[PDB]
């Protein structure tokens, strides 16, 4: 199923689903927490020309949203206002309860005309678009976001 | 003498671990929403197929009372709650060795 | 693969800081300021490995997000807690067994 990492002491190892270790202890739901990690840490180029090439428009795919409790400070963040020659908006309006990325050192604003070959915009590499504790596969208009991926780990906080 | 039930069940469903590959999960190059589903057929068994249709018709009665009571427009936790009740009935209370309610065998 | 050994993460914790008087909705904190800061450093293994898991977790998570019809899925964490308990105590627990976690 979904991979879940465990940290015994100051080291992260992963336990296969079929095996069963009784030494692992889950005391409460607070131990489990979901952490998003931005692509900046992965050494990819954060420049505007490379970011717009990674994103692409696609139809027939419904959007999906996943929540993440913890996130990382982003040096570069992107806000998109994009229209076509007819003035129509390629990206949808931000839904209720969704807000921009909380911590951004630089917010890049790119406003230009281009064709959209799809209803929603997805990441070609498959990276999720970060938001305020809600990760979405599609971009939303006028909302600052970061490129990141989400992980789930087990923390042995009390012993 | 009872061919009201259909012994052949051709079912549409989704795919959990069905595809172990890693170059297609990305939604941009992924398949369309209409094509994600996988098909399967169960046949040559009278009991399993007819009993399935029997349970859901009876389950509908109790399920309606649950939906009316809950204010949620969409309740996805019905199945997950059942798993919680499964564990709570056995290990919820003090588990006595060699007891009827406690599941422990020495 | 480039890794950042310093992890500066913003998160909210329910249990860690309970200050009081900030819960009132009229005087409560602004949306931008509710978050708290933390820093992870001086570790080669834990910091880089976390970025490795999330890149790989996207694979299994994408198939799950496609399978679920909910627009917003908050039940991912709750499902894992159930599976953890179901794997051990779900069935009959035999004393001194490999699956059973019982020690006399």
């Amino acid at each position: 199923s979904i991979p879940l990492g465990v940290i015994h002491n100051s080291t992260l190892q992963v336990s296969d689903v079929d095996k069963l270790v009784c030494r692992d202890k889950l005391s409460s739901t607070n131990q489990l927490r979901s952490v998003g990690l931005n692509l900046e840490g992965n050494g990819v180029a954060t420049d505007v020309p490379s970011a717009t090439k990674r994103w692409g428009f696609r139809s027939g795919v419904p959007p999906k949203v996943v929540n993440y409790e913890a996130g990382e400070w982003a040096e570069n963040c992107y806000n998109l206002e994009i229209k076509k020659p007819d003035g129509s908006e390629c990206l949808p309006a931000a839904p209720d309860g969704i807000r921009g990325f909380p911590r951004c050192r630089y917010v890049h604003k790119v406003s230009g005309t281009g064709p959209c070959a799809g209803d929603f915009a997805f990441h070609k590499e498959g990276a999720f678009f970060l938001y305020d504790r809600l990760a979405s596969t599609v971009i939303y208009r006028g909302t600052t976001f970061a490129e990141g991926v989400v992980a789930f780990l087990i923390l042995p906080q009390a012993k | 003498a009872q061919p009201k039930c259909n012994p052949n069940l051709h079912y549409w469903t989704t795919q959990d671990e069905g595809a172990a590959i890693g170059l297609a999960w990305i939604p941009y190059f992924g398949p369309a929403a209409e094509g994600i589903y996988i098909e399967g057929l169960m046949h040559n068994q009278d009991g399993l197929i007819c009993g399935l249709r029997q349970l859901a018709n009876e389950t509908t009665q109790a399920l309606q009372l649950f939906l009316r009571a809950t204010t949620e427009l969409r309740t996805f936790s019905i199945l997950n709650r059942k798993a919680i009740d499964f564990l709570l009935q056995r290990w919820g209370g003090t588990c006595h060795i060699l007891g009827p309610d406690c599941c422990i065998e020495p | 693969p480039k890794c950042n050994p310093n992890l500066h993460y913003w998160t909210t914790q329910d249990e860690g800081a309970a200050i009081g008087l900030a819960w009132i909705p009229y005087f409560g904190p602004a949306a931008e300021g509710i978050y708290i800061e933390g820093l992870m450093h001086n570790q080669d293994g834990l910091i880089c490995g976390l970025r490795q898991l999330a890149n790989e977790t996207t694979q299994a998570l994408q198939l799950f997000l496609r399978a679920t019809t909910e627009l917003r899925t908050f039940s991912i964490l709750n499902r894992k807690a159930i599976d953890f308990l179901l794997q051990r105590w779900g069935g009959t627990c035999h004393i001194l067994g490999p699956d059973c976690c019982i020690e006399p």
Epitope: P3, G5, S15, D16 | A20, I21, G22, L23 | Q52, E56
Partner: antibody
Framework: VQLVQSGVTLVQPGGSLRVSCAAS????????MSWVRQAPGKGLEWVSA????????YYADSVKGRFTISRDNSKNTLYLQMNSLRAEDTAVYYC???????????????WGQGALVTVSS | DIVLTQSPSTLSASVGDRVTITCRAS??????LAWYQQKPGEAPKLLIS???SLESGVPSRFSGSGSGTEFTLTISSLQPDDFATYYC????????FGGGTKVEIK
């Protein structure tokens, strides 16, 4: 950047056998491995795959029941434990490493020499 | 699932002759494809990946093109070392190897 398979093996029907794929010269845990078998006079067939981290394991529809894959990052060795062997499973098994993608995709640049397993009994 | 097919199985060729192999996948796998090279008794060697980019240490004469369902592996000049079986693997679906193309001299 070389992968070493087991030299020779022989088994019986339904027998159990372990194949060890040794890896050295480059970082192992960074990449995800996979098993590919080649039957005599037949094309390559994918057996099983495991992610670089080891949390996710992947098997073929025919191979999911009777095969088990495991890897240890500390020893840099890939173990494929084979159970309930059949005559159709007699093939030279190959283990390879990712060509380009890092723990994402299954591309293979560099392949091992292969291990021969004969279930004819 | 998805299984690609190869038009030529055994292609006769000579030194310095242009060779083109056509590998067509049943569904649309977009740009994710690779070609392999296997000599008798030797492990398969990666020729090209993604159908665009060539692996380091691979001769520059080898090239490939095509998008979506259609793919063509083209060798502008054939060499004595070049006689081996060639398979095409697509990563979109479950891993599927082609029938293979063996090259001989006639």
């Amino acid at each position: 950047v070389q992968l070493v398979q087991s030299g020779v093996t022989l088994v019986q029907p339904g027998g159990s056998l372990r194949v060890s794929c040794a890896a050295s010269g480059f970082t192992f845990s960074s990449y995800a491995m996979s098993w590919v078998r080649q039957a005599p006079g037949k094309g390559l067939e994918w057996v099983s795959a495991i992610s670089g981290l080891g949390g996710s394991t992947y098997y073929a529809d025919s191979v999911k029941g009777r095969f088990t894959i495991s890897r240890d990052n500390s020893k840099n060795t890939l173990y494929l434990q084979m159970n309930s062997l059949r005559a159709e499973d007699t093939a030279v098994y190959y283990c390879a490493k990712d060509h380009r993608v890092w723990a994402a995709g299954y591309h293979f640049d560099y392949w091992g020499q292969g291990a021969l397993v004969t279930v004819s009994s | 699932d998805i299984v690609l097919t190869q038009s030529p199985s055994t292609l006769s060729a000579s030194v310095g002759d242009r060779v083109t192999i056509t590998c067509r996948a049943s569904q649309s796998i977009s740009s994710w494809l690779a070609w392999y090279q296997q000599k008798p008794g030797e492990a398969p060697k990666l020729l090209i990946s993604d159908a665009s980019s060539l692996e380091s240490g691979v001769p520059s004469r080898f090239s490939g093109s095509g998008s979506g369902t259609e793919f063509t592996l083209t060798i502008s000049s054939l060499q004595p070392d070049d006689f081996a079986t060639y398979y095409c693997q697509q990563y979109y679906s479950s891993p599927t190897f082609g029938g293979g193309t063996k090259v001989e001299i006639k």
